[PDB]
Amino acid sequence: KMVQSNLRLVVSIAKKYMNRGLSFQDLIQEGSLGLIRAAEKFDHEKGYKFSTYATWWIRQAITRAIADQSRTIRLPVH
DNA sequence: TGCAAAAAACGCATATTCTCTATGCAAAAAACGCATTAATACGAGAATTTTGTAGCTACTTATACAAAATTCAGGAAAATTTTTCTGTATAATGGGAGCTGTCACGGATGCA
């Protein structure tokens, strides 16, 4: 539920990363791969929401995708 | 402007005579013969002698085992670059972008 609940601000990552040469949706479903990768290692008794930590994953999970994703030649990040 | 007609030239009488056609002289070529000498070739002698044939001998090579002294193909470390994975903590709370001037056809639904 909290997962499904924290599925609004995600649009921020979508907008910031439009589609990253892919698809708005795929740039949010891959962001969903985040969310879960928050909860778990979201950190309770922390002192504030994953609003500064959930994103964190989010944007580190998209990116990784995005560019893993999408040019039909994988690229090394280097 | 018709000729009859005269003198000198221009045509029928020979000397001259002089290119001229005509034979004996003579001088040196030539070529023929007496011929002489030398040289081009035949006769004999034995001397070199190369080629042709045999056996011995030295060089050259046919061959049979193989790990020479050297090449190479993997195998397994590094070495450094690169790749994939994981992680970094305030708040942030519904998405733009053309379709609106085509003509005609064939179903297929909706709407009383």
Side-chain angles (χ1 to χ4, degrees):
Chain A
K1 183 178 179 180
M2 176 178 73
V3 155
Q4 186 173 355
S5 295
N6 295 272
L7 283 200
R8 152 65 78 85
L9 41 97
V10 281
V11 295
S12 61
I13 332 288
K15 183 178 179 180
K16 175 170 182 126
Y17 294 80
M18 294 300 293
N19 64 34
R20 294 299 104 127
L22 271 148
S23 105
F24 155 89
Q25 186 173 355
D26 71 37
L27 188 147
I28 89 104
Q29 53 93 49
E30 293 177 350
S32 96
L33 291 166
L35 185 82
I36 59 170
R37 189 38 51 108
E40 65 282 25
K41 291 173 71 176
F42 151 70
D43 293 72
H44 294 83
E45 48 92 60
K46 179 59 163 60
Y48 45 81
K49 292 189 292 185
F50 59 88
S51 88
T52 85
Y53 197 51
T55 67
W56 206 259
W57 295 89
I58 299 306
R59 282 203 29 210
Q60 91 73 26
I62 63 169
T63 301
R64 184 270 310 268
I66 76 156
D68 167 66
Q69 190 52 255
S70 85
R71 276 199 265 273
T72 76
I73 296 90
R74 277 258 317 270
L75 315 170
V77 328
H78 182 62

